[PDB]
Design a protein around this ligand. Structure first.
Ligand SMILES: Nc1nccc2ccccc12
Ligand SMILES: Nc1nccc2ccccc12
Ligand SMILES: [Cl-]
Ligand SMILES: [Cl-]
Ligand SMILES: [Cl-]
Length: 163
């Protein structure tokens, strides 16, 4: 694992990450999708072979030797706040298992269910806190990728607050 495991945030395309593996904000059917998922499909299309997996799970498919961890967050348009919150926590716990199994020293990760699956709500804090609950026990360097300038500041602050 990393010598001093850290969290960092960068405002850039996750398809251009500098980490040993990537988490996709996938859909359950392994379709090219939108946003993060479409950028991952363009960069690592080979990783979508048998990538379909249920809501609240993660499935890893290799693009050459580069791992892509397909994590399926809930679409809060379809789920109740209560059940959606449970599936969103579960998807991140499955990401932590896969990162540990792969023995990577670093992982690039988006905030699950904060885009078209947000059901029109700001879910920065909800999603980021479930990311921390899952990843805190792992020793990989975690690099969170976002698009919005205000989200970059809020994620950076939330990381710094824990020290
Ligand atoms: N700044 C930034 N962050 C994430 C994705 C992007 C895609 C294309 C241009 C800029 C982007
Ligand atoms: N490509 C990409 N990378 C990071 C964050 C994103 C957010 C929204 C759209 C695309 C993104
Ligand atoms: Cl960019
Ligand atoms: Cl989303
Ligand atoms: Cl964003």
């Amino acid at each position: 694992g990393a010598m001093a495991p850290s969290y960092r945030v960068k405002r850039m395309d996750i398809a251009k990450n500098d980490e040993e593996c990537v988490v996709n904000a996938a859909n359950p059917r392994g379709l090219p999708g939108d946003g993060v998922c479409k950028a991952v499909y363009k960069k690592w299309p080979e990783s979508f072979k048998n990538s379909a997996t249920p809501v609240g799970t993660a499935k890893t498919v290799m693009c050459g030797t580069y791992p892509v961890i397909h994590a399926v967050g809930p679409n809060f348009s379809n789920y109740t706040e209560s059940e959606g919150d449970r599936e969103l926590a579960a998807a991140y716990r499955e990401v932590a298992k896969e990162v540990t199994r792969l023995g990577v020293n670093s992982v690039a990760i988006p905030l699950l269910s904060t885009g078209v699956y947000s059901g029109g709500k700001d879910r920065l804090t909800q999603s980021l806190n479930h990311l921390f609950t899952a990843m805190d026990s792992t020793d990989a360097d975690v690099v969170i990728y976002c698009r919005d300038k205000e989200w970059e500041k809020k994620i950076s602050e939330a990381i710094q607050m824990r020290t």
